[PDB]
Amino acid sequence: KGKLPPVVHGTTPFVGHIIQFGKDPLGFMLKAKKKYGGIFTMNICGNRITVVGDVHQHSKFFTPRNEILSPREVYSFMVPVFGEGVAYAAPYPRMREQLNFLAEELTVAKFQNFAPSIQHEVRKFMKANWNKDEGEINILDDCSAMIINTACQCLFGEDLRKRLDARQFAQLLAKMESCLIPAAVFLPWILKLPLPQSYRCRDARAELQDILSEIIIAREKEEANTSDLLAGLLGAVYRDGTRMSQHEVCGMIVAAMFAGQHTSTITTTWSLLHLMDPRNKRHLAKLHQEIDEFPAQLNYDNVMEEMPFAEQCARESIRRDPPLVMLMRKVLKPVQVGKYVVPEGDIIACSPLLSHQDEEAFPNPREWNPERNMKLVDGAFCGFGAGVHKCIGEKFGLLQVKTVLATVLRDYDFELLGPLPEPNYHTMVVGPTASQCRVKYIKKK
Amino acid sequence: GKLPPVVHGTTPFVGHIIQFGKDPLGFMLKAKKKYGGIFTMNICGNRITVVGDVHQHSKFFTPRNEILSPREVYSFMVPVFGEGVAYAAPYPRMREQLNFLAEELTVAKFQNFAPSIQHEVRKFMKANWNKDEGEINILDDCSAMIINTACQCLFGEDLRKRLDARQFAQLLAKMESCLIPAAVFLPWILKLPLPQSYRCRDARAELQDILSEIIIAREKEEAQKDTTSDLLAGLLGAVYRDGTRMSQHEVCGMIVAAMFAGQHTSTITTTWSLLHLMDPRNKRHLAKLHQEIDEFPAQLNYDNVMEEMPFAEQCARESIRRDPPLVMLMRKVLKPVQVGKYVVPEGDIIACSPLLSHQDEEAFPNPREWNPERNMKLVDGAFCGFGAGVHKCIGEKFGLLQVKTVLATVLRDYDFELLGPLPEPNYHTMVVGPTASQCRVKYIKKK
Amino acid sequence: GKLPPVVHGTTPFVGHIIQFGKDPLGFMLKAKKKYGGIFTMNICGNRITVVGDVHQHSKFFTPRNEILSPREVYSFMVPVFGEGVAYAAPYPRMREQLNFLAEELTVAKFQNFAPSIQHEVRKFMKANWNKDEGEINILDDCSAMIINTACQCLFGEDLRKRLDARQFAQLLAKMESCLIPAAVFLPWILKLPLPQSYRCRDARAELQDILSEIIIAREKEEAQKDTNTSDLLAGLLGAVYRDGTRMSQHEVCGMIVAAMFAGQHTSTITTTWSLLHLMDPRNKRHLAKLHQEIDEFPAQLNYDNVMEEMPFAEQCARESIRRDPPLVMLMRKVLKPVQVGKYVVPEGDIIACSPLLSHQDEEAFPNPREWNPERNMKLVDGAFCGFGAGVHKCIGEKFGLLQVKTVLATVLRDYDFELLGPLPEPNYHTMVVGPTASQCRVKYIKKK
Amino acid sequence: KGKLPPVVHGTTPFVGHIIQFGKDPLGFMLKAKKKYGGIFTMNICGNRITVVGDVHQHSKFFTPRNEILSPREVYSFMVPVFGEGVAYAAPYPRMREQLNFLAEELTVAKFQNFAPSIQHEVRKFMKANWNKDEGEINILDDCSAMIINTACQCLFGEDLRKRLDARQFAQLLAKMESCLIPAAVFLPWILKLPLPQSYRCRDARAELQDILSEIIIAREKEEAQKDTNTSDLLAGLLGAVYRDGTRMSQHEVCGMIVAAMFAGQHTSTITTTWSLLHLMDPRNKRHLAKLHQEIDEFPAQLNYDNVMEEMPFAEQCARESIRRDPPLVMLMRKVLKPVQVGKYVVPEGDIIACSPLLSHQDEEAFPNPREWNPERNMKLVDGAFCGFGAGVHKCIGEKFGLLQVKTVLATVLRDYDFELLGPLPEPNYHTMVVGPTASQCRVKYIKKK
Ligand code: HEM
Ligand code: HEM
Ligand code: HEM
Ligand code: HEM
Ligand SMILES: CCCCCCCCOCCOCCOCCOCCOCCO
Ligand SMILES: OC(Cn1cncn1)(Cn1cncn1)c1ccc(F)cc1F
Ligand SMILES: OC(Cn1cncn1)(Cn1cncn1)c1ccc(F)cc1F
16 A cells, blocks of 8 residues: 655756756656656655645645644744744744734734834835836836835834834845755755855844844833834743743844735735736736725725735735745654655655646636636635645735735836746746836826 | 965864954964965965055056956956956957946046035035034945945936936945955855855846846937937947947946946045044144135036045045055965065965054054054055055055045034044945944034 | 753864764764763764664664654765655565565574575685695685575576676675765765766666666566566566555665675674684684584584574674674664754754764673673673664674574685684774775685 | 858757757767868857868868967866876976876887886786686776786886786776766866866875885985885886976976876777777678788797887777777867968867877768778878877877787787677767767687687
8 A cells, every 4th residue: 555656757866856957947847747746756866746736635734733734844944043942943832932922923913003104115125216107117126125124114113213224124134044055955065155145144133033032122111112022932832831031032023024025025026017017908908997986095904805806816816926946844753645645755745736727627827817716726826825824924915015006006007118027937936027027108197 | 486485373174263353353363474475374175365565455456467366356246247247258359348337437537426426415414414413324425425425426317217216226225235355265155055145146136137127228319419428428439449348238337347346446545544534633623624615615616626625535535545445455376476585486376554654653554543644655565455466456546535525515514523532443344434333423513 | 852962072063073984983983982872973064873782772772663764864875775765765665575585584584594694605615715725815715605695595597697796796886885883974976977876876786787688588488477486676676565565676786685685784794893803813723613613513514503603603794794893883873862862863863872982891702802702792782783673673684694603604614714813803984884995905715 | 361260050058068069079069060161169168169060171170389379277177086286287388298298208218118018917917807717797897907907017116016006906997987077078177066076086006105205205215225126117207307497396206107007098998899890790801811911920929029110900990999989089179379270260269189080980981981991091181080189288108009909909809809799889069078879898718629
């Protein structure tokens, strides 16, 4: 009993498929699925990675417990950012607890005065950098800018932004992001070489933790209130009565800012790219309807329970081109999947990038269509993952994407300068090709 | 001949990096003291001989490219310049390319740069410093002014509509991001699949398509040919000694090299100077500076800044003497060079540090003191903020043009005040400047 | 939960290697003495904890693969075994594979092995030691006799026609050229464009095509179905995984190379050492007692003569391995923390048992540098782990001992030996540790 | 005043054409030569290498003095084997004298009893290893073994082979060669990595040096009687005298003896092998026939003369094998001063190369290039054949080498016939010295009955 998933042919003797796969990740798998079916095994530098390409077996990957499927080792290449013993790095229970701490820091109830704050930053930026009747900009960069500004304005209190504003923090982030080497998942060793990056990362992170400390100690003096994400983590308590270290606190914060930064920016950038695509005049018009009925100053309910189509666009761009191409786990205990049995020590993966393309659940995959149904196949859509490690920021993330859309589209139109941007898979968080993201903007004179 | 003294305390495979990393300047200061000006570090199996003896600077800046070559030591910048450009190009191709740029930067090319610079510096202040007073990050604001004043001076109008200063400084970041100076000692780093590496290529590619985009339109519109040459136009006119023209690839690479070069160094200089100018200790220097500028009208002309601003230059030059933006100039020894009593073998990396040399107490007594009145020629050849000899900075004139001009304009309308102890230099970055976070300052105008 | 001491004196990025490489045994002898049996070295930024406490051996050999895994620590050998074979393969896949080889080496598979071993050993003697007396390198000669006897026993007649023991010895060399054990601590080594890595690739390719061309040729001739004395290849071709499927020609080639490589070096070293000690003046009594045991035997030995009636010969071989174990460092990757003695070894750490170190423990093996066949191996139950223990315990022990024993009994029945200098000292700079080859010149004597 | 050769398109960001090149060098270059012409420029990890593919300009690569075109930096990857300051690692004048010292040790006047010794080792091995009516062997390995045996027998004196035999020596060559990483030419930093191979090499060369030394201090004591002496290679490199009146150092001696043995080993065996493989190929029946006629005449104990000047076709076979698949596939030089090549100019700092592999496929100079024809005209285009290089560094072992290959061919085929068991081997371009893919060299030998 227990059959093994087919190992993809044409595997180099020792380097595996890392080259074949790297060049064209989507095509590689997309083809591979046809020759061997949904479930198949890649050999990446001696590593067995088995992808769940069958959309009907997703629950098999998102359901099992950490004891069977584990994310600790797979995501260890991020330790430099989070810090040692933080998040995934820590033991499961410790990890479980910490992730939760952040989760509740991003729940609807904590969205007080977030909509206005987002609206405030988006407009200050627009009235700062798009002050001409019409102008040429890189929408990917400008969204990344607007996104970080609004993310900080919401999760950071006033005293924190004064000593460390949005533009300065971004700098710390990039310095810490410069040591994130995703190939480290297949080359754990590369994380042990003498690298300058990992030095600049220790610094940047150490600088942040210093500020935080110097703000906590400042609050502890002025203590003798709109509690932000910071004050939120400093209050949380473990199951044994102890609190988080400033090291742990600093780690979660960074994780939150990184996590929400690129995904939200990409999910916004895409949409805009689609909505401004001539083939979408339909969706663009409908959207304007949905928001033309809104006043200048938006409120919580306005975007949460009254912008369904907007959310559909946000959720459709993520279905077409998922920011996270490959969700991985370490198989600690053998798991039945389809007609196959993925063995222990193997690397098991569900690719949002892949599954999203199954013509069965998503016929005509390469067409950006908000209208199409996401539930057509249950568990098929995994843009925010599912089960144990479901995105705990989906709500907060959608809030931004949507509020930024509304804001931008209410005041500006857009046109493409060339063919639609094609996804670039050479980045940890996948987004449209930056060099293909040059666009013109129409002001509403 | 005998080899220099190899500073002891070397680790099995690391070498001195660990200790050099912690403090480069301190490390050398200590070494020079113990071993003398000429000593040898070992950086990951790589031998690097620094010319600490200030008297021997010419031994470094003088020899021809046959003996000393910057080609292999500057390759890590290929991602910025592009394949086969600048250093990444054949030796003679490098010389010709660098000349073409040197010619595009001669004083003869500064006709309305003065007015341009002031315009941008007055649009920024009136837009970012409008309150009676306020707190800001000077280093960040000077950077913004510098890229603006550069793009306004070197970039034609038709080019600036496709890519304004802001969006250009945007593409620089994405390209500077890939830069890994350490690659000089750990070459395999470049061979490693790193995101940054992809970043740079795409950023450079984006600037590439705009330039070409811009170019051909110029040819189409070029038909009338009846009546102001920018940098892009100048380069496109350069013809090699073999009768061929630079390729759009080479034209792009050179423009980036120019902008990248003048962007960081110019802002770092302008900023430092300002910081020293607002320090209590330097009350006298600030007073003398105003006198020199108080005489000038609203609109400054080329002469005013160049010939009639001698102390301004001394301040800027002194700011580069104290905290030199380019801390380590390197070369590859292709043939043994006699330095002092010593002889540097071939294959060895020879280095002159404007940072270490600018601390020489003989040449610069009270080194950590910012004194515009000090004598730079005390030891002829000591100061090398602009490198020297064969590879002397080809943008010194244009650079000083901005700095001096920018200061005259800002200080004419504003005063400044520190918010803490004067920032310390941050050595972690490829172009050394004052620690960013320490650069918040308050501004004041006294109409 | 307390960590084992980290032996002090570590350079920044190198670790203890430089020191350890100079002298591994001396380093572990010095460590063990200072910090106690359980300690931790650093090897190029890799924590490696050696279970030197000879009373804690079970805590290394016993844990299940989930906890302690050999898979990654043995991946530098992939170029030899092949992609997804043996260690490279998934654990279930692996465990089954090794069991197949296991079953092809049970004592039930020694039908005419003894006679085959003698024939070779006598063919070699009468071809290379024909003079009244002569000078020879006994290590080199034992290597030949061992590869000849192994091939004779395991390879069918058709296989040996295409690839004789000499030809196969070549392939082994070509293949074991790449191996870079250091790849264990410096993995990127395997990524570099090294000549070695291509050589392996090609050599295993050669052996690969011959096995395949032999198989398809056995299938055509199979049309007759005449009685065939199934060889090692035959048996593996007859193995079936729990999932019904059969071993591929690739995996079949791997297990054959695996066994041949494993037995060739360890068998020859054990043989040579034993001969070396037996000819050492200090061991006149031991040689004398050995002859007594084998004088009673006839020209043609049988399975029972060597198995149940050569207990002192085996002792000699077993004590040779106790003194100078061929496999010096057994390693595992720690997946889940393990309680060892008082200490706890954290996950991500490499755990090791060094037979070499363990076999020197004075409480277990007093006067440890003395080759004493009379010594008690079980003085401290568990101390001796020449053949490993627990889950991965050697599966060729019996077959290996069969050879060493049968060979000793043949050689010493017709020959005597004298050293030409001080007894050879082990050379630790090889993947499998044996006596120094250059110190291996020896004088032989015809008996009669 | 000059034009730069075209640079081939499609360059990967940091690895250049390295991946494409590595796959199929011959093809890559062939296609490049086609698209761009004989003189083109590849980019190997930021390194510009210009290949003189125009078989008419070969002289512009082999001629120039060292000051213009230098082999030092290009050949520094062999330093671990020759040693610091030896051979190319040395200063040119120093270098030249050392090669000279080796040259005069390999001239034809030193060969009287070479032929007989060669035959002896070849036969000893055949009767030792091919003593059956017919058998299956890897002709590559076996020729390798015979070649290393004969070489030693010819250059080492008895007292040495006593202390050192061809089996032990080959064992040291192996150890040392394990550090020869050709790629190190483009990726020098490679040689600075903590690799165990470089330690194994230090130890092999230091062990060989000690052996040689104990032999020398012995030849200096056994000296007093001064018994009749036939000096071996070692004896000769001990008498050589620099222009400054000083003698080589045991380190320098240890290097040259090693460089000689290495250079002589692989090429001799690769050429002998290929030859044998082509002769056993059914398509070359007439060539195999013509060869048997040239040797049949000779007696068992071949003589220096009859092998030197009475075995012409036998030599043409060795020389056409080298022309088809040159062992040394890429001859490089560092350009210190620019050089005019054809219309183009090769700039300083650039790596320049002459590819025997590429030039040898020139349809004009060698029509039907992939066809092994020993009757072809090698001079059809004067200068086109460069298997033994030319000019400043032309092979000094050419004559000693051919002497081996030919004598080995005459001995082997006199008693044995061969049949391929598969298709003609294809060259394996993944080794420092290029030969037939070893795994494809299994062949059937047949005792002449
Ligand atoms: C709309 C944009 C977003 C997308 C498309 C997205 C996508 C995902 C996906 C696919 C996963 C599952 C990863 C896996 O299976 O290993 C995940 C998990 C996670 N996300 Fe996001 N995410 C988004 C926004 C955010 C935001 C805004 C935050 C916080 C501010 C965040 C924080 C997290 C965290 C902490 C987890 C791990 C949860 C756990 O391990 O239990 N994400 N996200
Ligand atoms: C005012 C601040 C500046 C300082 C302190 C400075 C400093 C230097 C130094 C020390 C060198 C020689 C370094 C070496 O030997 O590698 C150099 C060369 C160079 N500089 Fe600057 N520079 C400044 C402004 C500029 C500007 C505005 C440009 C505009 C293009 C520029 C472009 C260049 C170029 C292209 C070279 C290379 C010339 C060669 O290879 O010989 N620099 N500079
Ligand atoms: C007679 C001298 C021998 C000695 C001293 C010896 C030693 C050892 C040792 C200590 C181990 C365990 C290594 C570890 O735990 O990592 C082992 C495993 C092994 N040996 Fe041997 N061995 C000998 C002969 C043989 C022979 C004749 C064969 C047959 C080809 C063989 C095949 C194997 C195999 C296949 C394993 C792996 C088993 C597993 O991983 O479960 N050995 N040997
Ligand atoms: C047929 C077999 C041989 C071939 C195909 C061959 C080929 C070559 C080639 C092409 C060169 C030029 C290398 C360059 O330009 O950098 C060369 C140089 C050299 N060869 Fe050979 N060779 C052979 C036999 C030998 C023999 C028998 C020896 C004797 C030890 C030898 C020793 C040398 C030496 C010392 C050099 C360098 C000479 C110098 O730098 O001036 N070779 N060989
Ligand atoms: C992802 C594409 C497929 C290839 C995957 C790996 C590619 C690696 O390219 C070459 C990397 O070379 C690694 C060299 O690392 C050298 C380690 O140096 C460590 C420090 O050395 C001195 C002190 O130990
Ligand atoms: O899931 C990520 C890490 N991701 C990047 N590569 C593979 N997975 C980011 N992503 C998830 N939500 C939003 N972005 C993450 C998970 C947890 C976390 F704290 C940060 C973080 F980036
Ligand atoms: O020409 C070689 C070096 N060769 C190896 N890679 C590239 N060229 C060998 N070759 C030349 N003749 C015979 N073999 C050589 C040159 C000089 C030397 F001393 C040794 C040596 F192998």
